Write a protein that binds this DNA or RNA. Sequence first.
DNA 1: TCGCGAATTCGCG
DNA 2: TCGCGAATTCGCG
Lengths: 261, 261
Amino acid sequence: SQGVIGIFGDYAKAHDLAVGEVSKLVKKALSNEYPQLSFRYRDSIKKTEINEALKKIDPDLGGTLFVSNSSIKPDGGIVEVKDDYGEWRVVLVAEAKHQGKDIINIRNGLLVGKRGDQDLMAAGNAIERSHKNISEIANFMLSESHFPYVLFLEGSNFLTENISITRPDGRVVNLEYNSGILNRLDRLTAANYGMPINSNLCINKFVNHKDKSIMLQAASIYTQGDGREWDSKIMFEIMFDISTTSLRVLGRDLFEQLTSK
Amino acid sequence: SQGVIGIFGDYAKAHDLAVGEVSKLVKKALSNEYPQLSFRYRDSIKKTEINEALKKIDPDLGGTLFVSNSSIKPDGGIVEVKDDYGEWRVVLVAEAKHQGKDIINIRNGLLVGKRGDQDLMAAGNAIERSHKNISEIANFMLSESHFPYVLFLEGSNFLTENISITRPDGRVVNLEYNSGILNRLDRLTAANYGMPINSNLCINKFVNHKDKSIMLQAASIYTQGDGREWDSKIMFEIMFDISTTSLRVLGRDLFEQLTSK
DNA sequence: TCGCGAATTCGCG
DNA sequence: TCGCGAATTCGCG
């Protein structure tokens, strides 16, 4: 890839880094490409911070807090950059979820179900929780013109293509991705307003029905439709791409540092 | 209450109607108060409908659909009214969730935990799924100026005041609502941007940081902080109130029917 | 301690 | 059939 991005990508590949460790690798690559700028990595954000960001937009917002030490902790963490005003602006927020272990059950001779005879397990809905952290970050970045939220999906419940799994017996269980018994990808499409998945949707879109004007905050939803594990090298490239896009949007508030330094 | 609203409320009280049945009672009361208008009740909405509503706002929106027969089914249902143009406009969307059975466990001599010695159970996070249907309805009503989504909460995980539960032994287990071991109310505050709970937040607010303009879609989040069950009479009054507010916002597109009839 | 997160099995029309 | 929903127990710093 461009410059050192190819070097860093191979390092992630060699160590099979988790989403959280890749976010750290991304900020390390960002500080390398932009020596004049200051970057940091956090593992969580308190509800107090989000409430404070909300009050700055409107006094009636961010007024509730039942548990004083409340917070959100994205398994991928958060990356930020300091602007010309001394304030930290979020550049990246990663998250990785899993659901559906049918591929594993079929690789083995495991029959699931209440009777122990089913080849497949009726897909659950625990993935719907993903919408919470997306809402929190959206509120935290309501004053921003970009929304760098990335969600990586993998498992039997996130297929985008048909696959065949062979059991120890020899029988091939053909899985159709468009089957509502397993596919739960539609339980996330609301997060990006139906815009294409596996795409960088960082730059906020502005729509309107009547003379109104609304800002949409679409999350980037990536999935491994093969049923295989995610490749750390490509996760890095995707996250770095979204991070650089965030910098482009933040460009106006970063000029003094890239120049006067 | 005003007119027949007091009569209908007592009926719901007498039968301890579920949230879904109260929504039906609300549309029955609406058709009584507004004989000139036409109301209907639905139990679900297909993803195709939401995608179509999205395309009308922007051609790039609502382009994904992996499972053709995908849909959302709020346990409270949806109430709608036909406008002067023949289109059905949503007036109400109810939902009721439960979480935390500590009150019940303490009423009995049941000790929970992996060792069977704990008085309380560490509160889970399954309630976070509520954000999904809220996003779906928000996208479905992105062209609207009102968001009549109501969420009723009850259980040991949604306390707003301290309570004491006595076990068969006689020992009183004092529960503090502000304890992060049980309280999960903060896992929903993002849905209404931190605005006050137990309030009618139907009319959409318009904010802005810079010359931008954004429309907020805040959901009404009601909770029974006592730990007790919800009263059907008050659920009806709350839902009817939000429904009438929706009519006020829709007023301009209902005039021809209230007049020319 | 206290508080957030994993993501599951299976009922229901 | 196929597809959505209930909301749980307990590990982890």
